[PDB]
Design a protein around this ligand. Structure first.
Ligand SMILES: Cn1ncc(C(=O)NCCO)c1C(=O)Nc1ccn2cc(-c3ccccc3)nc2n1
Ligand SMILES: [Mg+2]
Ligand SMILES: [Zn+2]
Length: 313
């Protein structure tokens, strides 16, 4: 109970900032998460023994893939931590509990392949879940781990509170399906601009949490340039492996997934910043003004890709 987690001075300061990188020391990532739960939620939110056992079972169920790995899970949780800490009074007790867990679990048992590839391969998961295939699987894996003996971190919640928190987690994880992002952002854009956005309306909170999940999931574009640039290598290592697997099924992959078209990456990143990333953090900043540093960092990285195209790097 009186056992706090403390980080070294540089981490203690920088972990509060949106652009924090969790570093290459994997054995510190569990401690970083517990630190973030304790400051975000409270030292009383979870039984420490149960929380520690939950974290280590989650870690075990992330695979050794270039990008959709344990490091991604903790990185996405940190971006959510930074949002919650900068918007103290906007979020309920159950939301702060649910969302850090949802972020840690949102890509559980990822194989490094898109929903598209599972459908074309005719994977069993594509027959069980026709839409948001991998994301329904990630939620299914989260419930499985929560039901392991000694792993129920929500055990002190009432029946109805437990159902509310698992419903927060399910919607949050489903919302990481980028196919659902475009419509969700358009609706939030219209609600904000016509002034009908209402944070007491539950269907409205769901939309706003959904956008926070996209923002946290894409947060590679909100880091300092050298982190953003090196993370791109891992992203394209997965995309290009899936491209290779598309060619084995006798299907020309999109250029994003074709390693033969490496030369077009700079222009592809521009399109992504312009069509997905900048719109995401723009709308997020309108609804939650203190998340503006995410938008600033994204714009800084857009400018760096413009420099790559002009041969200045
Ligand atoms: C889903 N997700 N999550 C993180 C990121 C991300 O990229 N993060 C940068 C990390 O620094 C993405 C992502 O969708 N990126 C995209 C999106 C569309 N693209 C089109 C091309 C392209 C086209 C033609 C040729 C070469 C590439 N490349 C793309 N890359
Ligand atoms: Mg995912
Ligand atoms: Zn993810």
């Amino acid at each position: 109970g009186l056992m706090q987690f403390t980080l070294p001075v540089r981490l203690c300061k920088e972990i509060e900032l949106f652009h924090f990188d969790i570093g290459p020391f994997e054995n510190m990532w569990p401690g970083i998460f517990v630190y973030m739960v304790h400051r975000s939620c409270g030292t009383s939110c979870f039984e420490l023994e149960k929380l520690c056992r939950f974290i280590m079972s989650v870690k075990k169920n992330y695979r050794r893939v270039p990008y959709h790995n344990w490091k991604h899970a903790v990185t996405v949780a940190h971006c959510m931590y930074a949002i919650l800490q900068n918007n103290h009074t906007l979020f309920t007790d159950l939301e702060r509990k649910g969302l850090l867990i949802a972020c840690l679990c949102h890509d559980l048992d990822h194989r490094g392949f898109s929903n598209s590839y599972l459908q074309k391969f005719d994977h069993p998961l594509a027959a069980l879940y026709s839409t948001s295939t991998m994301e329904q699987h990630h939620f299914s894996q989260t419930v499985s781990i929560l039901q392991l003996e000694g792993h129920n971190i929500f055990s002190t919640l009432s029946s109805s509170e437990y159902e509310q928190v698992l419903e927060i987690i399910r919607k949050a994880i489903i919302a990481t399906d980028l196919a659902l992002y475009f419509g969700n952002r358009k609706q939030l854009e219209e609600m904000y601009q016509t002034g009908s956005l209402n944070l007491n309306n539950q269907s409205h909170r769901d939309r706003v949490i959904g956008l926070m999940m996209t923002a946290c999931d894409l947060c590679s574009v909100t880091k300092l340039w050298p982190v953003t640039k090196l993370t791109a290598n891992d992203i394209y290592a997965e995309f290009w492996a899936e491209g290779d697997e598309m060619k084995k099924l006798g299907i020309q992959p999109i250029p994003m997934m074709d390693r033969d078209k490496k030369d077009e990456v700079p222009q592809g990143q521009l399109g992504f910043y312009n069509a997905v990333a900048i719109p995401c953090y723009t709308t997020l900043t309108q609804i939650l003004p203190p998340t503006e540093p995410l938008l600033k960092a994204c714009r800084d990285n857009l400018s760096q890709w413009e420099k790559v195209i002009r041969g200045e790097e």
